[PDB]
Design a protein around this ligand. Structure first.
Ligand SMILES: C[As](C)(=O)[O-]
Ligand SMILES: [Mn+2]
Ligand SMILES: [Mn+2]
Ligand SMILES: [Mn+2]
Length: 232
């Protein structure tokens, strides 16, 4: 697997007063960060700026994991003394060559990574939210979790303490696969079938536009940000 094509889109949506999502798509590194709190936009932007500088200076598995740690520390040092809590999720994919261990995902919070293969979209990451933990534990299905009242309550977040333990795992993927990283806004309310239809648009630049349109037409209750990566 190498990168054939990639695209990104971010949209405030019609409801939220600002856009606190951020995204990154540079070389082999792709990421979404969904900020929260009064300065969530400062948190997501700061996390991705820190991730990208850290990875650029050490572009391997260890360098990536360390950049994630530095992003946590930088957002925390900047925002940690504010009267209220702001922080961010982070989901990052590094499309490493085989000599570097192949594609790797690092995730903290509820911004999912999906693999799209033969028209079928499968979530690869676990969601660190109250509902997401119930799914992980096998207590409820993803369908049953859809309208869980604590769906949006994070159980892990970047930038809120000196200590973060992200999930870090190798991606089962190869030539012809598509990866999608998104903030949770995409799945706020839209019909899953309409999402999959948009997510499978052959041109990734069309896919990201259609994904934002699907989320907004479904009500646009949240910011939506999407990164689409085609592998060859
Ligand atoms: C990660 As959020 C609580 O701003 O959707
Ligand atoms: Mn947010
Ligand atoms: Mn949310
Ligand atoms: Mn969100």
């Amino acid at each position: 697997a190498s990168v054939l094509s990639a695209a990104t889109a971010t949209d405030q949506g019609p409801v939220r007063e600002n856009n606190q999502d951020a995204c990154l798509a540079d070389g082999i590194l792709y990421a979404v960060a969904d900020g929260f709190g009064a300065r969530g936009h400062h948190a997501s932007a700061t996390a991705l700026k820190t991730l990208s500088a850290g990875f650029a200076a050490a572009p391997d598995r260890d360098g990536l994991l360390e950049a994630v740690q530095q992003a946590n520390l930088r957002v925390f040092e900047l925002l940690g003394d504010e009267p209220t809590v702001s922080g961010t999720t982070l989901t990052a994919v590094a499309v490493f060559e085989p000599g570097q261990g192949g594609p790797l995902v690092v995730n903290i919070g509820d911004s999912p990574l999906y693999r799209i293969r033969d028209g079928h979209m499968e979530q690869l990451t676990d969601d660190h939210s109250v509902a997401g933990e119930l799914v992980r534990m096998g207590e409820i299905t993803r369908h049953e979790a859809r309208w869980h009242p604590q769906r949006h309550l994070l159980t892990r977040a970047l930038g809120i303490g000196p200590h973060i333990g992200p999930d870090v795992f190798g991606i089962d993927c190869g030539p012809g696969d598509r990866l999608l990283i998104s903030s949770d806004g995409l799945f706020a309310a839209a019909d899953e079938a309409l999402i999959v239809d948009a997510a499978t648009s052959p041109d990734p630049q069309v896919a990201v536009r259609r994904l934002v349109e699907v989320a907004n037409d479904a009500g646009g209750s949240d910011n939506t940000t999407v990164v689409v990566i085609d592998l060859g």
